[PDB]
Design a protein around this nucleic acid. Structure first.
Ligand SMILES: [Mg+2]
Lengths: 83, 100, 147, 226, 50, 233
RNA sequence: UGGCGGUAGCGU
């Protein structure tokens, strides 16, 4: 369902960290069991990752802050479990 | 056979040893899909000889290129033959003409 | 139940194996490369479409990029098997991305042999052709009249 | 399996691009049957579908197609082109004469045609002409007849009447495409996609049904005995 | 000589006949060159290369 | 008689030029239905005509196709190729086993097939092989099935359930009995319409199919395929 | 369960 990624390239800006962020997101949904932010029209993980960057729901900054969010959350959960 | 040719197909077919060529003239005493027995004429007779030529055609023998080498007769019983006349058609040969 | 059973369903060519193969190649790019890889465009990523036969079917418009003609040439296909490689195949090595030659910036996808002839024949005018001089409501009317 | 059986079409996917635009899809078809069905359907649709269309028009004050009218800035050819695209449905009779009269401003659309009950304009907002002069009066007498297919005015060829090409068939851009389709391991099947754009008189999904019914009735003589 | 042989066979001398489309059935706009040619199958088979 | 009602074409003549060449005339047709109908019938007939063809062979002493028999003038593969061209008509069933037994010097034609009653040999003079010696006999068991289209040996053997013994030779089956179709549309005279056309279909077959039956079958196939479009969900 | 050498051919 994806042929061109020119808009994704211009959204990321350099066509190189786009590949890295798309691969990271694809691994997150494929291995980490994450839920895609866009409906999947019977598509692979890479295509879904590329498709949910087009409208800006995934980029390096928000992905980093979101990963930090659940890592703080799991650290707090472990601390509460210890106590 | 090539519908359009150059006339050199006969020479190429005959000169190559892929086709069976009658050594002596005569009549086809016994034709078969695998062997041909030709009763030679009295003119080409040899002293103390019955006068029959036996040609054992090679059937379905592999070539150096893993292809098929096969000879098929092109004569019938009682058909007179002469020296140099073709008796069997080799691979890629039709009635003594090269057919690639 | 076991991967041995997986191969045993695979090589026997069960009916569901074709469906599984269609599922796994839906969005999995494959890299096609010609033997002389003179420049960057010698290897390009394409989306596979399953066909019957033993020959790889190539889009005509990319042939000029491959310097390939259909008189016995052979091509090699490689399958990326990691997420990163699939991402770069889709985003960097895809045929749609390569439109301009990196050597000089000229376009690489142009009609060559039959598209040019067909467009030239279609876009031509006589002086006494059938239906000359009429007025048409639009292109659809022209197509209907031609058909 | 059996000699007398054939792969009947299935998975009839129909999508509506617009109100008068359709795209039908049929996946399972015998090898080469997609072309056989598509070409026949296309030919029947664009050459044998009955319908009502404008055949001739009477224009007051104009005696030829290349004349000029000061009331309307559009040429006579433009007026004929605008009238040609009008779609009219007639019930109960073959030919109908309609009258149009307009004056004042020039947003002349199909809604200004005199109401007669039998005639039903699918698009009354279809523009016919445009008047520039304030006291410019335009009076026209159009004739709409029920025919079949496309009949150009050249073959049809008294000062007032002007002939316009009649498009009785209510169909535009009927295009069929047959490409590959695989069922079980047989990849040699044909999948047929038909894209059509009706003028607006009838639903595009009904044009296919009517054409298929016409073709089936054409073969009834040999079909009935089997 | 070729034209005379074609005339003997009651064939057009130009060597081009009128063909029809197998699928749509419409006649082709121009006559096409139809004839008989010697074709050779070279020893380069796809099953030996795939 | 009007624009809404179309004139229904019907069969009017069947001119049998020969046992294989035939002409079928259909009239009247209404301004373009002739070309459409002719093209559709030509496409259907050339691909969807059922017919009987030879599928399996079994010679007495022959064990594989690449061998030879003592006495016959042609190879076993040649015999199979000639058998492929045999034209028969089978009534009642789609599966028949025929027996051929010949001896003595001479050709072995289709007339040497043992009479079966429900199987008719359209070409009784079709040669198969030539016995070139006395005391040499040929005994064959020919297998004939009814089908459609062209089914090669590999497609049939893909099942591999039978596991036929050595000596049973498989031959490609061309079940199609129609070999050539040519449609021609001309003007037809029907009282005073002056705009109707008639369609003449010239068909060259193997003689195992009735031209009228072939036209009827093609029309039935077209109607059955078009009923899906008639319904349209 | 590999290498070397020679020969011929294919696509550039
Ligand atoms: Mg080449």
């Amino acid at each position: 369902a994806r042929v061109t990624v020119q808009d994704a390239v211009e959204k990321i800006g350099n066509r190189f960290d786009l590949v890295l962020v798309a691969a990271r997101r694809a691994r997150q949904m494929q291995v980490g069991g994450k839920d895609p932010l866009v409906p999947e029209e019977n598509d692979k993980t890479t295509v879904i990752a590329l498709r949910e960057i087009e409208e800006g729901l995934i980029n390096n900054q928000i992905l980093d802050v979101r990963e930090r969010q659940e890592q703080q959350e799991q650290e707090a959960a472990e601390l509460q479990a210890v106590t | 056979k090539p519908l359009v040719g150059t006339g050199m197909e006969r020479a190429v077919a005959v000169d190559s040893g892929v086709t069976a060529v009658a050594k002596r003239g005569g009549v086809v005493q016994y034709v078969d899909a695998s062997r041909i027995v030709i009763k030679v004429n009295e003119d080409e007779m040899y002293p103390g000889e019955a006068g029959i030529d036996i040609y054992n055609l090679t059937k379905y023998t592999r070539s150096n290129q893993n292809t098929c080498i096969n000879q098929m007769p092109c004569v019938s019983l009682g058909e007179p033959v002469e020296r140099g006349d073709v008796l069997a058609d080799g691979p890629s040969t039709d009635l003594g003409e090269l057919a690639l | 139940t076991t991967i041995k059973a997986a191969k045993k369903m695979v090589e026997r060519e069960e009916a569901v194996v074709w469906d599984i193969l269609d599922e796994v190649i839906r969005e999995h790019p494959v890299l096609l490369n010609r033997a002389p890889t003179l420049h960057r465009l010698g290897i390009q990523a394409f989306e596979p479409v399953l066909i019957e036969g033993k020959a790889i079917q190539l889009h005509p418009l990319v042939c000029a990029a491959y310097n390939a003609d259909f008189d016995g040439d052979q091509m090699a296909v490689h399958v990326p098997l990691t997420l990163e490689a699939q991402l770069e195949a889709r985003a960097l090595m895809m045929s749609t991305n390569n439109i301009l030659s990196p050597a000089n910036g000229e376009p690489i996808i142009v009609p060559s042999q039959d598209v040019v002839l067909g467009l030239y024949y279609m876009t031509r005018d006589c002086v006494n052709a059938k239906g000359e001089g009429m007025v048409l409501t639009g292109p659809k009317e022209a197509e209907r009249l031609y058909r | 399996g059996s000699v007398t059986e054939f792969l009947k079409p299935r998975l009839v996917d129909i999508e509506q691009v617009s109100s008068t635009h359709a795209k039908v899809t049929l996946e399972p078809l015998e090898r080469g049957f997609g072309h056989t069905l598509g070409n026949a359907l296309r030919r029947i649709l664009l050459s044998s579908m009955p319908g009502c269309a404008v055949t001739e028009v009477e224009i007051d004050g104009v005696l030829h197609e290349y004349s000029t009218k000061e009331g309307v800035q559009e040429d006579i050819l433009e007026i004929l082109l605008n009238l040609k695209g009008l779609a009219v449905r007639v019930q109960g009779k073959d030919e109908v004469i309609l009258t149009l009269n307009k004056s004042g401003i020039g947003p002349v659309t199909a809604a200004d045609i005199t109401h007669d009950g039998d005639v039903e304009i699918v698009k009354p907002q279809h523009v016919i002409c445009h008047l520039t002069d304030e006291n410019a009066s335009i009076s026209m007498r159009i004739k709409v007849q029920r025919g079949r297919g496309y009949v150009p005015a050249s073959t049809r060829i008294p000062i007032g009447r002007l002939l316009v090409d009649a498009c009785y068939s209510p169909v535009e851009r009927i295009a069929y495409n047959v490409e590959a389709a695989r069922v079980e391991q047989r990849t040699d099947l044909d999948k047929l996609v038909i894209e059509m754009e009706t003028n607006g008189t009838i639903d595009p999904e009904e044009a296919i049904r009517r054409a298929a019914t016409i073709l089936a009735e054409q073969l009834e003589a040999f079909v009935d005995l089997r | 000589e070729i034209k005379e042989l074609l005339k003997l066979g009651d064939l057009p001398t130009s060597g081009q006949i009128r063909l029809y489309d197998g699928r749509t059935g419409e006649q082709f706009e121009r006559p096409v060159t139809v004839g008989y040619m010697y074709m050779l199958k070279l020893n380069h088979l796809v099953d030996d290369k795939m």
